[PDB]
Design a protein around this ligand. Structure first.
Ligand SMILES: *[C@@H]1O[C@H](CO)[C@@H](O)[C@H](O[C@@H]2O[C@H](CO)[C@@H](O)[C@H](O)[C@H]2NC(C)=O)[C@H]1NC(C)=O
Ligand SMILES: *[C@@H]1O[C@H](CO)[C@@H](O)[C@H](O[C@@H]2O[C@H](CO)[C@@H](O)[C@H](O)[C@H]2NC(C)=O)[C@H]1NC(C)=O
Ligand code: NH4
Ligand code: NH4
Lengths: 537, 537
């Protein structure tokens, strides 16, 4: 074949299609390249098998199925809630990759691989927000995305080999090995693969930096609002087995800890949709029913012990938090208070009740430590203050501080870190104004969604998008986000060093460099509060 | 008589002298007017008696004796230390008043009454720092100062009428009633007397605001770096009696808690100096052996309870702190760490040990609550941060926070309050640069010492002194430190309201208005830590 759009992968030939980006610039896309045997029937819960080789030319030309998950119907057809909802048909047969190359096609260029996040229970590579075409065209990078199994279908653990856990991670791993073996034919460099993800995607990206198996499969990592040391990232395998048996019971299957073989077999028989819909029960804020576990294969120790011993890939890291990480999660959980409407406020009575519900595992001397740390003492009863106080305590404990820890441990092991604090509200944000810059607002801007002429992004926001797209891209290219010739419209990004802890604020009219961010609160959660609960128990 | 320099005081007549001020302007001074029968012999430890009438005229021209006290000598003949050492012969006969009037003599001027503060163990009205001549001439106000018995000689408590306690406070009280009777003859209005003091002197004027016997003796109050709720201000009756018997035991007297009249009789025999030198046993930082006690007459309840119930004089108060209150007392206490050297620093290990030596009563969980609250979490190990940390944790608990509490409590009850933060370090400072603006640095500017050209104060400092002398003065006059016109040279000083809690920063180039000061830390000491120590035993 002399036809550029056909590519001969290790398992067969595939045909892509030439499409315009929203920006107008033309790119070459390959949608739904199968990288694994569909994990159906006997293969459910288990690790993926490589794809069977196919005879002829396969048209990899249609956005692939998204994996079986719940749909967010709590706010109805609210555009802020539905943008995260899967936009393709749901199927167990969902293990597919997407490749987008720029035109003119490069001979050998950087590869930016996007692992999506949804708290390991939801998400798809096919979301309209993850605009591959805009990033690939504007930065000259091969943009790659993968679909991995999610929820119980991707992370069920029972201790047995028929449910060994981390299926979704081995899905990602296998997909990385595919990129290694094939990305050169699309014009990428199998040695310059940069993994980048948000939330559970960032947790995944970080787990690949830790993992023994996916170690030599990529070069660099960008981690948006996530780290492997986060509370929700992993569960004890003692708990994971219980969550699984409680799900077995909930769907009407044998749930005896002795006959675990009876459990998996029955579970393999049930409909995937009823399976993913009965996972939720008594769960606190920011804790998800089925997530990664320390299995022995992908991870043989907790991320804590991995970070401590310094056992992680020696590479550059770009990482950062948003200003209001918590709000999003405090809206869904704790729904009666803090509802979806403008100008909502929290009383001192309600704040005191919330810290009890948002931290239901601390003895009470610790709750007082929290109420003191997360209260504005210049005006202790202020209704706005007591609301924003809730966002910070959730945002710090579950997100911002875990990101900080990871970045710091990489920094003192002698690796170049680049820390950001994303502080920009989109002018047409559908959410109430009090939410501010929430969890995963940067995603639109990193994917060049403002450049879409059919959308109402301002001229300033279009610059800001191109700005952070460059930062991200040439980090994936060079290992450093700064321009080679040191520009002024592109401010400097100091290295997040162990002793200095410097971060760059990402907003419209700023080049501000701070330290942390939020150092006092992180020391509260990491240093002070643990030794208090020890002293009071 | 027709000589202006002689005045017919109710108990006799006195002759003063006209003398120049450092400003060049002249004033009339009366120095060492006896307001009480000398508290010698059987009258030691007891409340003062009014002085006997004298025939003829009395030369009140030379500065009076200072009360028997310990002499600071740990830094030898060092300018920083010696300025607080007594500058007149030490005598048990020391109860005298000083009156300084401007020229030309006013008819019914405002009266500013200065109560000195040497931590209730030291001090004298005669100190060159307190020189009244400048304040009187420059602000056109008659300035008064009193001597009160200090240390055990003025504050020995046993519970018996022989040693009832608060002799020094009754010394102060009798001086107030003297002012009311006689101040009109000097050109003062006995209805508009405002008390102002610093440290122990400030907690003295605060106790007059609380006392039943003092409430109709003055009009307003200025309280520099002191409040009646300060931990060092009062001691329990149990302690005060045990402190007394230990003084009896150390000096070689009967010390049995059965027969107390044997102890006091013996103590009346011993030398005044041998008595004040042996009172210093094992006392923590900012702990003074002989201080005011809730006796029954001068105070019949703790200032804590008196503040809670709102039982204090309805009147305007002007109060505030310095930035480095703690350093002074640490310098003397922790003598081996942070000595009187230039550029001294504290290691993290030395800081962790210091918090135990500075808070020797908290359990251990509370020690850790302190170390967390007083760590610069930007650079947790920084030698400068860890040294400055010691100043703050001492200065807050013992000074700043208690001043805040009193000011707010007065404001809450509907009284007009004016809070200051004194941040100006004098250029010609004898102490090392790291000490900053220490306890009692404001005194020099309050009394107009920069207006003495022989002391070489800078031109901006000369204006700064006139600025704060005015604030103080027209507060004593009007009840508000602001002038009528409000020009740029005299910035606005907003009221310290219950919810606002505004303070004016008193520095050279500044005009800044803040909240507090140091709200989070006062909330730490008044709210969090007390409830933490209770939860942990
Ligand atoms: C897409 O893949 C299908 C088979 O799944 C393949 O048939 C298409 O090629 C086209 O096949 C048509 C036969 O029904 C034929 O009419 C058409 O000419 C042919 N196109 C070409 C270029 O040979 C695949 N699409 C494309 C664009 O080839
Ligand atoms: C001050 O009080 C003394 C008390 O003895 C008094 O003596 C002074 O008056 C002066 O007294 C002197 C007696 O030695 C006498 O020589 C002198 O004339 C007299 N001074 C006069 C009248 O001006 C008192 N002060 C003053 C200045 O008299
Ligand atoms: N999300
Ligand atoms: N002092």
């Amino acid at each position: 074949d002399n036809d550029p759009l056909v590519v001969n992968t290790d398992k067969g030939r595939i045909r892509g299609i030439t499409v315009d980006a929203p920006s107008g610039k033309k790119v070459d896309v390959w949608l739904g390249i199968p990288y694994a045997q569909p994990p159906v029937g006997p293969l459910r819960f288990r690790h993926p098998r490589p794809a069977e080789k196919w005879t002829g030319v396969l048209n990899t030309t249609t956005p692939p199925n998204s994996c079986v998950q719940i749909v967010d119907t709590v706010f109805g057809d609210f555009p802020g809630a539905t943008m995260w909802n899967p936009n393709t048909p749901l199927s167990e047969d969902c293990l597919y990759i997407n490749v987008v190359a720029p035109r003119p096609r490069p001979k050998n260029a950087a590869v930016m691989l996007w692992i999506f996040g949804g708290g390991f229970y939801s998400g798809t590579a096919t979301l309209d927000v993850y605009d591959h075409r805009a990033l690939a065209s504007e930065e000259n990078v091969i943009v790659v995305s993968l679909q991995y199994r999610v929820a119980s279908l991707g992370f069920l653990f029972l201790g047995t080999p028929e449910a060994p856990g981390n299926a979704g991670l081995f899905d990602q791993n296998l997909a990385l090995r595919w990129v290694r073996d094939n990305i050169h034919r699309f014009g990428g460099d199998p040695s310059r693969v940069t993994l980048f993800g948000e939330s559970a995607g960032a947790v995944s990206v970080s787990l690949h930096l830790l993992s023994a198996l996916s170690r030599d499969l990529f070069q660099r990592a960008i981690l948006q609002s996530g780290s492997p040391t986060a509370p929700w990232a992993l569960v004890s395998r003692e708990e994971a087995t219980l969550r699984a048996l409680r799900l077995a019971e909930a769907v009407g299957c044998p749930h005896e800890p002795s006959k675990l073989s009876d459990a998996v077999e029955c579970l393999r028989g049930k409909d995937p949709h009823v399976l993913v819909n009965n996972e939720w029960g008594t769960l606190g804020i920011c804790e998800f029913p089925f997530v990664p576990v320390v299995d022995g294969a992908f991870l043989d120790e907790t991320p804590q012990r991995s970070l401590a011993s310094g056992r992680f890939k020696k590479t550059e890291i770009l990482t950062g938090s948003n200003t209001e990480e918590g709000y999003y999660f405090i809206i869904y959980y704790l729904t009666e208070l803090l509802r979806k409407e403008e100008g909502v406020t929290v009383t001192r009575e309600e704040f005191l009740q919330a810290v009890r519900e948002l931290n239901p595992y601390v003895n009470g001397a610790a709750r007082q430590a929290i109420v003191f740390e997360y209260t504005d003492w210049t005006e202790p009863d202020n209704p706005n203050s007591n609301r924003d106080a809730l966002d910070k305590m959730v945002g710090d404990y579950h997100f911002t501080c875990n990101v900080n820890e990871f970045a710091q441990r990489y920094a003192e092991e002698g690796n170049n870190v680049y820390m950001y604090l994303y502080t920009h509200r989109s002018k047409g944000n559908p959410w109430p104004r009090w939410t501010g810059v929430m969890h995963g607002d940067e995603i639109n801007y990193v994917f060049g969604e403002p450049l879409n002429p059919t959308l109402g992004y301002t001229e300033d926001e279009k610059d800001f998008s191109r700005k952070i797209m460059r930062y991200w891209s040439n980090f994936a290219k060079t290992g450093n986000p700064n321009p080679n010739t040191a520009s002024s419209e592109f401010p400097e990004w100091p290295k997040h060093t162990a002793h200095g802890r410097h971060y760059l604020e990402l907003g419209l009219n700023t080049s501000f460099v701070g330290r942390g961010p939020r150092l006092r609160q992180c020391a509260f959660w990491k240093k002070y509060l643990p030794q208090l609960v020890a002293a009071t128990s």
